[PDB]
Amino acid sequence: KLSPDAIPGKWTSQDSLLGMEFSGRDASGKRVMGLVPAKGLATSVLLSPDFLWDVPSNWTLEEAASVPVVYSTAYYALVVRGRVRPGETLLIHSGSGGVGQAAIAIALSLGCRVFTTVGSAEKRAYLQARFPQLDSTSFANSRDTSFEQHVLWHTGGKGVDLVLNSLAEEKLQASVRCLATHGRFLEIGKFDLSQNHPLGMAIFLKNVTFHGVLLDAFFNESSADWREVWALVQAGIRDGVVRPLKCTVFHGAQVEDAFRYMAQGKHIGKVVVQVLAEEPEAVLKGAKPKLMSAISKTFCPAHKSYIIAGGLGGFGLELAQWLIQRGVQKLVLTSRSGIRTGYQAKQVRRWRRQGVQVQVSTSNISSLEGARGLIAEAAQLGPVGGVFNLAVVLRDGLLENQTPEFFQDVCKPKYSGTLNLDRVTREACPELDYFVVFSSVSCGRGNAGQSNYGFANSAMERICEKRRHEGLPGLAVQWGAIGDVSGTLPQRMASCLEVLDLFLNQPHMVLSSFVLAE
Amino acid sequence: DSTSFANSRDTSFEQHVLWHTGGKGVDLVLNSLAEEKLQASVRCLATHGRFLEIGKFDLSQNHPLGMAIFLKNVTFHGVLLDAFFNESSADWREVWALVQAGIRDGVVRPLKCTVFHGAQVEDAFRYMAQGKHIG
Amino acid sequence: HGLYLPTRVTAIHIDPATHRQKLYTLQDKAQVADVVVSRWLRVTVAGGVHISGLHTESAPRRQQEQQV
């Protein structure tokens, strides 16, 4: 229902944005609960210390997983933005939810009379049990506009001072009419705001401060203003106002069960996922989390240098971008000509802006001296991580009109270049983790008039197979027709990159991929 | 400076403020203009911006306001000074103190004044109605 | 990244006369109009047209995945 890009901050993952809060141990062994923009559902999280609280001695790690998001948003909305003062009256929609419970806890500490809206009698009973200060006249219905009448009656028709709204459409319109003079409206929902629904400006005649509350802005900006909320939450923890919520724990394997349980919407409190059980000891100073088997995909270290031969080519530019999204930051493209089109210039400018250290080379991999120079440049950047060979020179035509010069021209980049790369790698590249050559099904299946192309591609496969017989990395991918940049339909670039991600982990030497026609 | 002045009778200040602000916008708007001008001024806000409204026409007519602005942390205020005379005196003492401090610190300077005698009150009203007075 | 499609527009102006006056023919027989996009001011002005306050929302990919 929510587009992945709607999350603030450029991620480019298009996935793994799940998770905002966590409770676990630290790099030193200290119990900590944190708040992260995304990627909270993992066995490890990389976070700055500004977004971590210590877990007091009474609390268990399970309880701590419920505090961060809800209490941070509650404090930010009420104290930091709404500037609540003792004795006020406020309407907290959806009291049973996490943010509603946090707001009630913060308000009841100040002495404010509270109206809350709930969707069932079980939630009403749960909130009555949780907060005995609440009376029988502090509950309305959250599935209809009947709370407007309830509040305008039990408040004498004056209204409420703060309205922490999470409801949308008519219920949001109904909540505005509950405001009193000098009231404040705290909008923590995002449906009406996204749709740009109109808000009648008459309500502002009686002094009304309509707020837009978004906690996400802190996680990627405004660090100076975050410390106020952090300190407020810390003070609440020490004073006892911040109380953990009910937890419905699910194990790491049954995360889908947790997601379906949340989808049904019958939960009261917070839903937690137990990645790893808590040890009795206060500080464990442990080494690593317990190993769990998971789908393997390709990621690259930041300190390694990568080489793409013929990288200014349409597949080569697209492979480079794919690598950059996987953490590559030291890249060495090679081309006989150089940057000679607007597309290449745009891409390289963008990558250099993003901080990646792109470097273009004219070193021709065919000549052994050229290969050694290319590896020397890569080493200058950093230890050589991978070597990709996407170079191609085509001289098509039936065998009747071929010449030895054409075969040499076609085989110089693919055969000779691959041999020289292999030799220089076996000599002076001890950290190499990838070695890929891009071939064509014309080698395997066969095609008419591409005899020299087929000879050039096939020789690459032999070298890759020999390399994998000595333990060194090697791989050859037999593609069909690349689409965006035989009887086979052209294969889209996205599908190609997905398949390639699949291939880099397999144990085999030569692989293939194509799309059959009709 | 020469880049702090725009045109009030047109909606050309939106481009001026946006250009000289680098497209970020502004952090606080003290607005008293009409419908189209008001909609123009709303688009000058930046993230965590604050819109101070001291006019009455668009509020009295209940003109619509697109809520898409609040996707940022914009805060919309309805500022009326009459409410102090009817209640919230404890809130008025704060403003009283602020004005007194401004007076004693030198910030609060008097404005340019045009004097009309009691007998010529009608002339004063006509003069202010024309719209050429400064001060 | 991803295909963003228009969902709102704040103001569009079309003045056909100024449009016919702005067009200038290239060395070929083709008629062309120069375009400028100001992401600071939120105006896309080209020929005799003026788009202001465009908004585009991400649309989910159809995942028809016709290629297997």
Ligand SMILES: NC(=O)C1=CN([C@@H]2O[C@H](COP(=O)(O)OP(=O)(O)OC[C@H]3O[C@@H](n4cnc5c(N)ncnc54)[C@H](OP(=O)(O)O)[C@@H]3O)[C@@H](O)[C@H]2O)C=CC1
């Ligand atoms: N402004 C911001 O940036 C932030 C936004 N928020 C908002 O605060 C609110 C509470 O967040 P959170 O702490 O996660 O609380 P929950 O998501 O647990 O709150 C859900 C509540 O919504 C109502 N509800 C109705 N149908 C369903 C359903 N099918 N599933 C779940 N709830 C349902 C219930 O209240 P009832 O019993 O009355 O039906 C329930 O208590 C959300 O609207 C969230 O978007 C949270 C923090 C920051």
Ligand SMILES: NC(=O)C1=CN([C@@H]2O[C@H](COP(=O)(O)OP(=O)(O)OC[C@H]3O[C@@H](n4cnc5c(N)ncnc54)[C@H](OP(=O)(O)O)[C@@H]3O)[C@@H](O)[C@H]2O)C=CC1
């Ligand atoms: N797209 C397809 O149809 C398929 C591709 N392949 C193979 O996968 C790879 C994908 O690249 P592709 O899209 O074909 O690239 P191009 O079609 O753009 O051509 C190869 C690229 O590499 C450069 N290049 C060629 N020879 C050399 C050389 N000796 N030294 C340095 N740079 C060189 C070229 O630039 P310049 O001319 O300036 O050197 C060009 O940018 C190729 O190796 C191709 O053979 C196989 C199966 C399917």
